[PDB]
Design an enzyme around this catalytic site. Structure first.
Site, short mmCIF file in Angstrom:
data_model
loop_
_atom_site.label_atom_id
_atom_site.label_comp_id
_atom_site.label_asym_id
_atom_site.label_seq_id
_atom_site.Cartn_x
_atom_site.Cartn_y
_atom_site.Cartn_z
N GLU A 3 -61.13 5.64 14.96
CA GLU A 3 -61.54 6.14 16.15
C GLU A 3 -62.45 7.18 16.73
OE1 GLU A 3 -58.77 6.82 19.54
OE2 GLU A 3 -58.75 4.66 19.28
N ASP A 4 -63.52 6.88 16.47
CA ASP A 4 -64.61 7.76 16.89
C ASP A 4 -64.78 8.95 16.10
OD1 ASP A 4 -66.68 7.47 19.33
OD2 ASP A 4 -65.31 5.78 19.51
#
Ligand SMILES: [Zn+2]
Ligand SMILES: [Zn+2]
Ligand SMILES: [Zn+2]
Lengths: 134, 266, 46, 33, 65
Positions: A3-4
């Site tokens: 997720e980044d």
């Protein structure tokens, strides 16, 4: 790293990878009153008032400053100043409660109208942690 | 000899390419890792600055004095300050180095890994010597300084491993590979046209018999023979980072038996 | 033996107390730094 | 012939000391080159 | 900004190799590409280290007190 967000080699962080310094500079002057009433840079105490601070004043020398080598932290005072009004109402400058570090450089100059002008500078090294951004 | 054999290919003072044969991948890796992070070393861990005018700030420098590898031959006979009884530290648990530099030259004065001066008694034992492999014998440039820039510190090297922090690591890199001709199919090569064409074959492709179509898939295929290479930093001799590795990992497995023991009584 | 302040440009251990002017005994440069502490400071080495 | 106020001056401009100064000049001025 | 001691990635001492590299360039009129292979810096983790370091410290020293 989902997720980044990323995983970051610890060993690298140890060996230095991405460390950085961080300085902050607190500053202050000795106010004045047309009718010769001035403030002062000293290490105050009782003397009636008590309207002072809560942090240790000790780290303070007598000119009302810390030595460039001291390790500060919480709300330790970094500057001692006092206001005269009618006898010891405090006007000292504590270190930003959130931050902490080491004094890095004091300096005392004269302000145009000849007043005691001073700036304190704390240094800190911030290492990459888990919430940091890149 | 008896169990998992070795057969050192090349070898030097800063590397030990060798072939670990007849072992479990597990064990190979386990050792791989032990080398990397749990082998006791010695490094500066406490720095008391008395004076500094350089451009590098206190901790900046400190940090470095940590990575400056030190001698750790007999580190196995020095104690973990933490286990020693001296309130804080002693000759029995630590080494005390010193540093003092002054810019005299009108030209940039350089501070090196060499200028460190042991002060504590080494009660006779190779330990605490700023390891130098530098050709001119100065090693690791700690820092530079101008005209009258001074710098007076004091160091206190202690035991400690990698888990605790990197500076105590002694390995630094460790080549590891096996089954160069993907025979057990542990990978699935990516490609455009040809696996073989696009994907470089390794030095170790030799020391092992190429595939050769025809034959069915060897699924009973296990995995022994690992082409390693334990480099070193200095603190300890290449050979050591491997023996002491093989040992510590052993004592570790040991304690587990020992633990199982006290466990019985109660 | 001992000091207190300094001059930014003409680095020269100076010092004085209340109302003794905030200039250097040489360079006017009304600056003045505060020189380290005698107290020894210690650091973690990682 | 008469003084009338002050003009804050853009740095590195014509009327700025740093303007003509060089490498060594600056470093000595502490100002970064 | 001084040569990093040791490589962030693998940890292989690299504090010494500074001056040496700087000379295998100036004096030994050699190319960085190998000047490094020279100093023993094999794989990139270490190469990148020297090849890129920006020794600002000098510019710093050229100041004063
Ligand atoms: Zn002890
Ligand atoms: Zn002066
Ligand atoms: Zn590396």
């Amino acid at each position: 790293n989902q997720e980044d967000s990323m995983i970051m080699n610890q060993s690298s962080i140890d060996r230095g990878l991405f460390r950085s310094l961080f300085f902050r500079s607190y500053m202050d002057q000795e106010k004045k009153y047309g009718m010769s009433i001035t403030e002062t840079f000293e290490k105050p105490q009782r003397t009636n008032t008590l309207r002072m601070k809560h942090g240790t004043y000790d780290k303070l020398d007598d000119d009302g400053l810390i030595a460039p080598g001291v390790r500060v932290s919480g709300e330790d005072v970094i500057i001692g100043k006092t206001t005269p009004i009618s006898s010891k109402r405090d006007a000292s400058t504590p270190l930003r409660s959130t931050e902490n570090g080491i004094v890095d450089q004091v300096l005392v100059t004269t302000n145009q109208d000849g007043l005691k002008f001073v700036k304190v500078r704390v240094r800190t090294t911030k290492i990459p942690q888990i919430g940091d951004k890149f | 000899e008896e169990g998992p054999q070795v057969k050192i290919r090349e070898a030097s003072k800063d590397n030990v390419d060798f072939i670990l044969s007849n072992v479990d991948l597990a064990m190979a890796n386990s050792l791989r890792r032990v080398m990397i992070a749990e082998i006791p070393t010695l490094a500066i861990d406490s720095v008391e600055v008395e004076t500094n005018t350089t451009v590098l700030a206190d901790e900046f420098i400190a940090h470095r004095l940590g990575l400056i590898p030190l001698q750790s031959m007999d580190i196995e006979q020095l104690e973990y300050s933490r286990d020693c009884f001296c309130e804080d530290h002693c000759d029995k648990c630590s080494v005390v180095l010193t540093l003092q530099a002054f810019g005299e030259s009108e030209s940039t004065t350089n501070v090196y890994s060499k200028d460190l001066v042991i002060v504590s008694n080494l009660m006779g034992r190779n330990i605490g010597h700023p390891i130098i492999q530098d050709k001119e014998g100065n090693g690791v440039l700690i820092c530079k300084l101008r005209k009258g820039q001074e710098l007076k510190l004091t160091c206190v090297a202690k035991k400690g491993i990698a888990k605790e922090h990197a500076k105590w690591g002694p390995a630094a890199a460790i080549e590891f590979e096996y089954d160069p001709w993907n025979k057990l199919k542990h990978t699935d090569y990516w490609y455009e046209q040809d696996s073989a064409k696009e994907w470089p074959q390794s030095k170790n492709c030799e020391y092992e018999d190429p595939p050769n179509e025809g034959d069915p898939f060897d699924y009973k295929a296990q995995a022994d023979t690992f082409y390693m290479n334990v480099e070193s930093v200095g603190s300890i001799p290449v050979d050591q980072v491997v023996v002491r590795g093989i040992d510590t990992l052993q004592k570790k497995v040991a304690s587990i038996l020992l633990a199982l023991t006290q466990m019985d009584q109660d | 033996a001992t000091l207190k302040y300094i001059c930014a440009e003409c680095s020269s251990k100076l010092s004085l107390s209340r109302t003794d002017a905030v200039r250097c005994k040489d360079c006017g440069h009304r600056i003045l730094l505060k020189a380290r502490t005698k107290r020894l400071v210690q650091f973690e080495a990682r | 012939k008469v003084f009338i106020g002050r003009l804050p001056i853009m740095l590195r401009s014509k009327n700025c000391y740093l303007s003509e100064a060089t490498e060594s000049d600056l470093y000595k001025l502490k100002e970064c080159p | 900004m001084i040569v990093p001691v040791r490589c962030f990635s693998c940890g292989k001492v690299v504090g010494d190799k500074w001056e040496s590299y700087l000379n295998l360039l100036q004096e030994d009129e050699l190319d960085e590409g190998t000047a490094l292979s020279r100093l023993g810096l094999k794989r990139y983790c270490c190469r990148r280290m020297i090849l890129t370091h920006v020794d600002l410290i000098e510019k710093f020293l050229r100041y004063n007190p």
